[PDB]
Every structure is written in C-alpha cells, then in structure tokens.
Amino acid sequence: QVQLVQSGAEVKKPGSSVKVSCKASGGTFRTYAMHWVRQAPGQGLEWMGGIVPYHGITDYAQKFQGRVTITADESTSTAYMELSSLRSEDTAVYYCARDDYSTYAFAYWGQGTLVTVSSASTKGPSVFPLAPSGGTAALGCLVKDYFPEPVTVSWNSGALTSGVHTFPAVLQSSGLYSLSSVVTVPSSSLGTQTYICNVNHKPSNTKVDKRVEPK
C-alpha cells in the first residue's frame, strides 16, 4: 500500500527559509512524480511544482520562481520542497502528493505540514474558566494568547464529547491566537458532576487542566 509521510510542523520568522520533506513507501512504479501543493487557511489548493525522482526532471509554477526548490533523493523515495524569503502570506499547510502507474492525477497525499510564518514567537496559552450560572447550562474554557496553532481541547479526559464545541482560533492583532471550548450539560448536573477542560499546546509543551465550577 502506498504511504506518504511528511516532516513536522514549522514555525518561521519573515525572511527565513523552510525545507519540508516527504517520504514515499510501498510504491512499485519507478517513474512516479512527487508534487507540492499548498493550502492557505480557508483557501483552495495551489500546485507549486513537481519532480520525477528517477529522472530528476522538475517543473514549477512560475509564481514560485526563484523562491521554490524541489529536490529528491531517489534511493530513499524522498522529495523536498525548500521555500525561501518567507512572508506571512506563505502561512499554509503544504501537501506532498504522488501519482501512480495509471494516472498523472494526485492518487496519494501526505498528511500535510503546517508552516506558520510570523514575527510572533512560540508561547503557551492562558486558560480561563467560562463559569455556568429549559434546564440546560453552558460552561467552557477560554484558551487565550498562544502561538502557533494548533491547540487541542478535551473535556473530562475525552469522556465528555456530547455537546462539546471547540471553536476555530482567531488570530489577534498581537499575532497570538485565541479560542473558546464550550459544553452544554443538564442544569442539575452542575451540583452532582465535575467538569474539567484539558488544554494541550504541543508547540510550547504546555498541558493545562482547569476545573470549571458554577459561579
């Protein structure tokens, strides 16, 4: 079975460079192509360029001329994309895609590599409780001022999933992100049950557990 595994998420300052890798495994076709496709937040798909590692022949989209370098190591079935003079507009998920013996279309896709370009530096969030007061109550956690994305939020170590809404983060003018995670529960469970939000920000190695009590 063909599998594409990409290198981890990157955080960069404007003007810096990034080099992303993609390893293919399980392939039998010698002249497969490896492509780089990016997706800016909330946007569509944009092909940057591609390579056939067996021949070393590359092709790029003209808009990426001079800034993008695509290479490959045929022996390891690994493709690389290097993007230089990084701007905030280069913030996107970069996908590695591969064709197969039957088409030139993108039959296989990597999991994606988020590349965040910003003047901000890695910072863990501050977590504040959103206290509860037809017998339905709402409670939550405000996960404020972190960088970069992503942050994961669970309730009661993942045992509470029903009625949970973790909102997409908003980018503040400070360059830091912020979101809320809420849950609706029966009003009567407020005096008989415990509610804990578990916040994980892997980029800053921050883990926060916050007990949310009625006010």
Added chain:
Amino acid sequence: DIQMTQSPSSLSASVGDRVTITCRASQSIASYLAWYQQKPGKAPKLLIYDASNLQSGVPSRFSGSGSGTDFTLTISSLQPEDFATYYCQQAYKTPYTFGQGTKVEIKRTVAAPSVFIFPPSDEQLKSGTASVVCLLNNFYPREAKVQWKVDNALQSGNSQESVTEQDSKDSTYSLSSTLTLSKADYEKHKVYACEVTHQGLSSPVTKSFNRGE
C-alpha cells in the same frame, strides 16, 4: 494558465439527493480532469481520474463525465459521509490548476440557537483584560446576527466571531461572539447584553448580565 471554474461554489442538499458539480476549463483539456474530496482538517482524496475513472475504494454512487471544456461530478444518493468540499483539477498541462471548490452542506429543518452569555472570569480580570463571551448553540441555517450592547450603547469594532463546521450528528452550527474590552472600560459599565437574530427565533433574543451581580 488554464483557469478552472466550478459551479456551484456552495450547495445545500439532503441525504439521498442526486447532486451535480460542474467544472469548466478555459481551454480544451480532452479527458485529463480529476475530482478530489476534502474534509475539514484532512488531506484531499482522489475520487475520479481522467474525467470518468472511479478510483478504487471510492463508492460507485460517484461518477464523472465530460470532455473538452465541460465536466461533471455526479453523486447519486448523497450519503452523510459525502458532506465535504470537492475540487476539480486539470492534469493536462502545467501549472496544474484546481477549481475554487464546492462546499457541500447537509440541509436540515430550521433550529433556533440556545443563547448563553459568559462574564469575564475573575482570573482574567487580574491580568487587566475583559473578554465577554456570547454562545449561540446548535442552530440551522448557519446565518446568524449577533449585536452587543453595553449600558444600551451598540458596540462596534471590539468583537470577534467564530463558527464551527457543521455537526455530523445533528447538522447544526454553533457560534461564539467575544467582546473584548480593557478591565478599565469593563468596570465603568453595568449592563452587558448580547442580542441574537436568527431565522428560528420569532423575535431577536437577548441574554444579559449586570456586572457584579
């Protein structure tokens, strides 16, 4: 470049509906057109290659047709797992180009939001900032209007909204509106109100609190 135009950009359909998504190329691409499906937080997935070939492991209710400049993706009996964004892509000439995408959402009956207001926590107030959160829970359609009033004064430029993706279980949306003020501005006012206008509400609903009560 070859420009790919998809139609519609947004589509609301029900499970069991026969759905058609069209793709127009700026010049002839013979049969070299692929269709991809993409779900939130996931990579695209190939459905159809070279206009009409169904990719293995893709259900037979998906079919592709067309040649030259006009292409069609047909989904017979639209299933719950088909709600996603679809893209066409010409594989004819580099630079490879994609259509703008078609977002397919599930139709549902109108559902009014249940509305909740959260004052800033005492913990946040210590830091010198005040975030007031208004939650609109489980509503349909996605369109909703949230209006903030502080002591009867309509607020502008100091609020941010965030909307979830459509719920896979009940086909609803949820929204948060966050009013951001300095602790100084927060402490000089009493009445904090969130006003919600939505199709499922016969009249706009207001949730409010009095600071320090």
Added chain:
Amino acid sequence: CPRAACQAKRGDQRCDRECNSPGCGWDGGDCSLSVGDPWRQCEALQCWRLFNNSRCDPACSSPACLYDNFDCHAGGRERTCNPVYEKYCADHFADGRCDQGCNTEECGWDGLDCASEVPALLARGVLVLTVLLPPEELLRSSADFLQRLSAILRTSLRFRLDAHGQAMVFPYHVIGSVVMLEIDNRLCLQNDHCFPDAQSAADYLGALSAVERLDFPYPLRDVRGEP
C-alpha cells in the same frame, strides 16, 4: 447536414464546427486539415465515434482505421508524455545529448539523441505542412515544433534537407510556410502502430483535427503526403 444547411461553407478554407460532421465531410475537409476523409480506407464505418474514447476498440485498430488513436497500442499512462516533462523535452530535443526522461515514443524519442548509431528507416514520401507563420519565426522554434509533432505521431520527425543541407521550409504566398518533413521509423518496432508513408501520418493528423483532439500550438492550415 443531409440536405439544405451549410453548402456555402464546405471547402471554404475556414473550419466551421456546426458543419464538422461525417455527413458534411468534416466541413468539406476544412476541419480535417484538407484531408477529405481520414477514415476513407477504414473498413468499419463507425470508427470515428470510437476514435475519441480513451479505450481500445480492436475492430478500429488497423492502420486504415488510424490505430484507434493509439489506444490499443498505448493502453496505459504511456499514451501521453508526462506534463512535467513538456518544457524539458522541447528544450533538450535533438541537442546531441541522450536525455532518458524524453527517450520514449510519447515524448518524441529525445529527437533520436539516444539512438545515433541506429540507421534511419524513413517512411515513404514527405509530409507537407502549411503553417500560417513566416519561415524565420517557424525555424526560431523548430526543436519545439518537431518534438511536438514527434510526440503526436509517436515516431521521429525531422525537416527534409536539400542538397545544401538546408531545411526544406519555403515561404507561402509572406503569409506562412510550406514545411517538408520526413518520418524516421528507426525506433518504431512492430500489432501495428507505425506510419508506412507520409499520407498515413497526414490522415491521422486530420482525424485528430476532425475530433478536436489536436493541440498543436502552431497555425497549421493543412497536411498531405507527397512522393
């Protein structure tokens, strides 16, 4: 098309898609590069309908039936040159250096740079092309022109040379060119997929123009085989 429609447009030296049908003789040949009936020798009448389908139709695979647009010969992805090789193969065609990526019939055989020691095996006759571009302009992109035609015909194409070793490209009357090409089948090993003569190649090109599947970036007016 069977009676009373567009008789004033048949053979008017301008392709009209409304009249481009077998009944109207591909707009009197104007849409088939002056080839009257590219399928004139094809033994089965309904082959043109199966020419455009991207699948093997064995009954339409004979040379007379224009190899069913090579769908029986080149069944998989090998039917077309990789789009990522388009610029590369045009830039490296017949440059005297073997480029393996271009060394396939669908890419133009690298203009025979990998087969310099294999003798030429020419098809009968000369392929004559009227291109509405002046000789100087046409020759400024001659590698691209031959590489693309080689890729389409799945064989090697070159300019016929005269006694002085000059390409046989003549001015057309100021308005275009009369280009004389030879077909080198030295790598075309044979079932059947090789053009034995220049008229066979001209008919195949006419069949692509008739079904609107010819994508050649040159103002190509007509094609014919000449001895």
